[PDB]
């Protein structure tokens, strides 16, 4: 399903797909999941994370 995202935590590539580590709203740190970029509809949170690397 589609859930609200609280923060993007990390980024990786697995089997040719870009993935982002998502912290879900209402979920805990145990609920974080890696989701491919096609699953993501949180551009503001993605950009904040990438800008936050550097």
């Amino acid at each position: 399903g589609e859930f609200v995202v609280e923060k993007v935590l990390d980024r990786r590539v697995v089997k040719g797909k870009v993935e982002y580590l998502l912290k879900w709203k209402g979920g805990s740190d145990e609920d974080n999941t890696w989701e491919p970029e096609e699953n993501l509809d949180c551009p503001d949170l993605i950009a904040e994370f990438l800008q936050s690397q550097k």
């Binding site: 995202v5 998502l22 989701e35």
Partner: peptide, 8 residues
């Protein structure tokens, strides 16, 4: 806007 994502 609403920050959402699909969960696999």
């Amino acid at each position: 806007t609403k920050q959402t994502a699909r969960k696999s």
